[PDB]
Design a binder for this molecule. Structure first.
Ligand SMILES: Cc1ncc(C[n+]2csc(CCOP(=O)(O)OP(=O)(O)O)c2C)c(N)n1
Ligand SMILES: Cc1ncc(C[n+]2csc(CCOP(=O)(O)OP(=O)(O)O)c2C)c(N)n1
Ligand SMILES: Cc1ncc(C[n+]2csc(CCOP(=O)(O)OP(=O)(O)O)c2C)c(N)n1
Ligand SMILES: [Mg+2]
Ligand SMILES: [Mg+2]
Ligand SMILES: [Mg+2]
Lengths: 545, 542, 542
């Protein structure tokens, strides 16, 4: 152990030990010693314009690297401004460690309830929430926060750091930054035998199946077996139409997915890193099939989810072993092949690569096609929440992006831009495309200054309707009249340029592709406003569950 | 197990309990939860009414600790639930799987001008939920058992709103884990470290004392002959007789061979151990290769940051580790000396004619060891007597001992004993406590008599709270609030219909214990004790 | 009271208690909180060790209810605190001012691998705080008493970390409200409504039973002669003898004159009343002018939305209201009939030779009324006997009765009685309970004997949980978990050193009660009861 002048120095040293490359946040009196200590480290300080976005950026870093993104904020409002961010990350399973300042331990303002009980506030939306009361257990708590966020089913962790603890001296050491084995060999063999006997098997991918550490094993198992696959949105990016011929689409939103039909037909369903909370089991489990559960944790038994076999342990190890016990590729049953044949037909019908679509404001389909043109395998795509989100999800089979951040169970708006910046920081050599509506854009657009400051190569697309359309179409369907969903117009090109970023505003369908192309080629942050005609939304909504 | 339409959610609950292998339920009925007690009447599940809910949690814990399956407590709303709190916290601390089903007001009256029980139980449980979705009643219960029984066992609380249990519901009962050993690659990495170790030592924790790990543990020890020491949560895992290289229990006394071996160690392998069981600072000097083996990743601490972590099925890991141990260990000079000292230490601790009255603690311990045989379960309450018994655990040869008690909750012994007896009603159980601990749960004597439980409860009588008195004496040289009046425990026990005895002389001690042990049913023996020599034992504590 | 340097925070605490007028403290010592018990030794404050912490909260509540000043409980960390929960919740529900001082681990070990007691107590208290600022120790305590004693009294919890009470602190003891009557203008507005009322009625709540409001209440009733009815929290505020227009207690029975008058009312004036005391839906038809008088604004409900609210000092308001009442009330035809019916009702309820054995409830009530005189405090536990006693409260003439119990917590009687006796040790106290309630707190008999408390505890013996059994019978026509074994309560009581009695025939009832009452000290009488006629009484409940 060492004698540390400040607890902040030990915290920073622990962060370095955790492999943290940067920290997102906003400084304040209570937490400033930590920002100060970061000056003497290898960790880059990234100042944001609103704490909420610090949590969103950290979440993106977590989902991509698999290692926790870090947010650093001051006490009081500093911490409360992160709450929505922490809840969103926790919901989508993104590892995030938030370090929040607090008044000194003995501050009498605590007894008079003059200072926020942040631990109580964060406990409901985090996997781990705690306040350091013992200076000597500083590295310990920070270390445990990372383990709690990155292990098991990933989530967010909050650590409250009293000012006196980080400012005062401490004596401790840096704790170096798991070793869980695959499922039992007998159970794996058991499953390999169920597979060899199944006529209509199918894989249902969940959150844990999309983790980076399981990518290789998953790819190997799919290639060896050639068994159909369907995914929940928390695994939307694990597999796509283009990289697997037997992909059946993502389930949980549209009522005609091949994944749902195959699951109904299945005589053997193998869930990977799946939890019933990702998609209602009653929606696909007919009970007429043998059920296998593969994950880092036991299954949450439920009326429509009582696994016949449960393989708990290291997912990658379990999938690799299973792959080694497969003698041949699956020969699709006439029925299964028919269902895949139908998805092929529906994609054909959803497509329109030859239609004019030159109306203005732009038709959602014309915008989706233009987005597909610029989003390729070297481009990451982040998607906000709103009506355009449903359009993009319907066509996820057409996006050939390196990766896509779209899952958003809490339906939190404003995540796209912050997600893109975080995704960009993980791979600054690649391009990132973020997309939102005007509502979401204005909730985090302040981070545009952050983007310009970082020279972040992010292209943000704004679908403009001058209102909260996703809520409006719900009100129209229920009351046939609108309330609180309409607002005024804005000059987004000028809005963007006022930050020093490149701004564009589509004034006709013909200008769409050229504009997106020029915006993509811009070396640095750019924003493109796209007026949209949401009149056809009812047609798309008719495909929802 | 098909999806059915149930006349009362209470019926689904009961079927779910039967599916979990529940044989009995402990508790006290009330208006809000009465439909469940009524449903149990058509069940194969036995209803065991207690006299105080706290004891339902204690009895359920013993059941859980012994069977591996959650003990079940059932109480009504309000005070029925709040009376379980201490019991639930005690089970959670000792890792005993318990599921408490607590009644509550109908959902609609919750915000009406009822206790927020979930909020009160959340701090002392692993799982605390309230059923708000009638159609997910079987799920919440089922998953409560999962929470209590899996990983590091603990207590689970489920609030059942009256309208949910009395009203009809649809649903199916859910059937009552398959994890493998640690990564073989890592098991070799550890096996290699063992071959390079000069002073290897095993530190056993809670999970190491689980029956599912028995065979593999013994197999690993018989093949390596590496010395062993245990926390009190694994007090029963290994004893002096079956392992000559046993180094005792660590955490209480400052002169244990286990601690000396830990300090001397170059390689320490912890199994089913968690810091909470014994302050790492107390034994981890910091310059030894630390290996962690458990069902859960290590809960890192300042002085407990393992170099290697083997997470997974313990029995599987240990079995694989054993197969990778070529030669048995040859104790180093210091190691051998340390173990030799423990032997000399035992000879000393054992070595006179203590015929004074009130009885000398050593005399009582000696007599206790005589009646406690390998077929008997011994339960120990909290108090000064606890220290005396702990000091001599090496010479106790009981089927099992329930002594671990981190919260230091008094009153646990009798209810634990009743719970343990119900698991194996053909055997005898012996519980011991002080007068203070005795009156906190003695109301269960009626329950013991009602059940015809073959339990013998011993009471060390000093007429006070001695364990507290000695700490006050040491710190203030005067006493406060630790002295109370005397009682005739013989008549007290007889009033319940149990057999009572009161030792009135030293020579009467042994004969009285025998007459009590020979009683087929509940019996209590009050034993006046002279705690004057406690200072000499306390000097042996950390 | 100057700012001093204290050797131990524990010393400041004690001085603060003395400043609050605390005469005794109830509790059980422990390592974390022992310095406080030690500090009390140099205090004028008496240390009263209990046998179970829950009872410390019950005894403290009686003290608070009677003196108006918070009763004090002192316990150690962990189970010491969790054992107080039910007691604290019961006090908070009945409005009894109680301050619990609970020990805790040193501040630095809190987040270390200790119970989050504040979080557990917050749901059942008015004030739950933990001292994190050593220099504000006297403040947190002082303000805990303020929280318990002011507004609507309730319980308050204070967690004292061991390092804070053992370590030195600086600070001064803080001296131990001045609110005026409601706005005179509004008092007239109400006085006007009273002059226009044809069927005015007073509904008394908790605050109306406070001694500080006695004189003003009587003065207001003697001047207006307006009929009165009371919730059970104000059961003692007024009785049949002192007010011929008393309409009984409302909330339990479906045939009360009070409810009929409330329904008939055109003007209802509630004093110190809060909906929680009696469901407004049960009596507020909704077409009467509703006036609310209390120390706190009305806690609006669906059927309790007062037209006029007089917030402020109750005694002052009532005194001013009285001075604005010219003529006494002339009962309307219906009002007079209703009161006449209550008179005929009493004549009936009173009207035979019940010499059966086991004893008939009516016989027991009759005998109870004979021994309970105007100098005796009567405490009543929860169970079927409770209903029987409530039915006949009009014929009980005790100094005071502790019966209100919204949580329906069993075991309250004896500890309450001990607490009430300590307030007036020269008087006799009588507590009554069922066998179930008796065993939950009977351990305090040792405390009673130790104190030489002049308490007589009566036990209605049925060998079960009857109040629950009758509800099961009605709903399921069968019983579950409500039957237990018999006991010899005579020997049980004697074992403690108290006087025990067991009624073995009807004719022996009265003589046995007398012999017990004549005992100068603790005495217990077990009374076998035949609950067969309970269905006839239950038909009288809402
Ligand atoms: C923070 C927050 N508040 C409210 C909502 C509810 N809601 C869901 S998406 C959305 C916004 C729709 O506006 P926009 O982002 O402009 O997208 P559009 O549907 O209009 O394309 C709203 C208001 C939300 N998701 N997040
Ligand atoms: C519920 C509870 N309250 C307070 C304590 C603190 N304390 C620890 S052991 C004990 C009791 C000692 O009395 P007894 O059981 O008579 O044993 P002795 O040490 O006197 O033999 C007390 C008061 C506790 N453990 N549990
Ligand atoms: C702590 C607690 N648990 C459960 C209840 C529910 N219930 C209400 S009164 C009562 C007991 C009745 O037993 P007893 O005291 O013997 O009275 P009886 O009605 O039989 O005369 C019970 C079990 C309660 N009030 N308090
Ligand atoms: Mg919009
Ligand atoms: Mg004792
Ligand atoms: Mg009874």
């Amino acid at each position: 152990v060492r004698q540390w002048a400040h607890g902040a120095d030990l915290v920073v040293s622990q962060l370095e030990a955790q492999g943290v490359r940067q920290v997102f946040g906003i400084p304040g009196a209570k937490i400033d010693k930590v920002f100060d200590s970061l000056l003497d480290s290898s960790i880059r300080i990234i100042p944001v314009r609103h704490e909420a976005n610090a949590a969103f950026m950290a979440a993106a870093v977590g989902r991509i690297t698999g290692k926790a993104g870090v947010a650093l904020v001051t006490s009081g409002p500093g911490c409360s401004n992160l709450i929505t961010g922490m809840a969103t990350a926790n919901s989508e399973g993104d590892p995030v460690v938030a370090l929040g300042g607090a008044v000194k331990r003995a501050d009498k303002a605590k007894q008079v309830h003059q200072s926020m009980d942040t631990v109580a506030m964060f406990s409901p939306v985090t996997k781990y929430a705690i306040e350091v009361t013992a200076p000597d257990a500083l590295a310990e708590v920070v270390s445990n926060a990372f383990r709690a966020a990155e292990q098991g089913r990933p989530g967010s962790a909050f650590v409250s750091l009293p000012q006196d603890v980080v400012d005062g001296p401490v004596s401790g050491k840096v704790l170096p930054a798991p070793q869980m084995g695959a499922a039992p060999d007998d159970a794996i063999d058991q499953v390999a035998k169920l597979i060899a006997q199944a006529k209509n098997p199918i894989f249902l991918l969940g959150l844990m199946a999309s983790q980076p550490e399981n990518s290789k094993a998953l790819r190997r198992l799919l290639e060896t077996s050639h068994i159909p696959v369907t995914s929940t949105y928390q695994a939307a990016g694990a597999v796509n139409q283009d990289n697997f011929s037997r992909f059946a689409g993502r389930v949980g939103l549209f009522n005609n997915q091949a994944g749902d039909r195959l699951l109904q037909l299945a005589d053997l369903v193998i869930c990977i890193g799946y939890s019933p909370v990702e998609y209602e089991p009653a929606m696909w489990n007919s009970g007429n099939a043998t059920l296998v559960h593969i994950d880092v944790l036991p299954a949450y038994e439920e009326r429509n989810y009582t696994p016949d076999v449960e393989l708990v342990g290291d997912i990658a190890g379990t999938l690799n072993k299973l792959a080694q016990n497969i003698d041949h590729r699956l020969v699709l049953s006439p029925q299964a092949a028919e269902i895949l044949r139908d998805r092929q037909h529906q994609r054909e019908l959803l497509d329109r690569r030859g239609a004019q679509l030159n109306q203005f404001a732009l038709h959602p389909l014309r915008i989706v096609r233009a987005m597909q043109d610029i989003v390729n395998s070297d481009v990451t795509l982040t998607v906000d929440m709103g009506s355009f989100h449903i359009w993009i999800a319907r066509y996820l089979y057409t996006f050939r992006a390196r990766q896509v951040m779209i899952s958003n169970g809490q339906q939190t708006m404003g995540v796209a831009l912050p997600w893109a910046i975080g995704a960009w920081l993980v791979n600054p050599e690649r391009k990132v495309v973020s997309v939102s509506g005007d509502g979401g854009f204005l909730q985090s657009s302040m981070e545009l200054e952050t983007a310009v400051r970082l020279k972040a190569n992010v292209l943000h697309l704004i679908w403009v309707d001058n209102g909260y359309n996703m809520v409006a179409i719900q009100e129209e369907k229920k009351y046939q009249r609108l309330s609180g969903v309409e607002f005024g117009p804005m000059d987004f090109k000028a809005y963007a340029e006022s930050f020093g970023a490149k701004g564009f505003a589509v004034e006709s369908a013909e200008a769409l592709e050229p504009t997106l192309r020029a915006a993509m080629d811009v070396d640095g942050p750019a924003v493109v406003a796209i007026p949209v005609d949401y009149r056809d939304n009812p047609l798309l909504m008719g495909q929802l569950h």
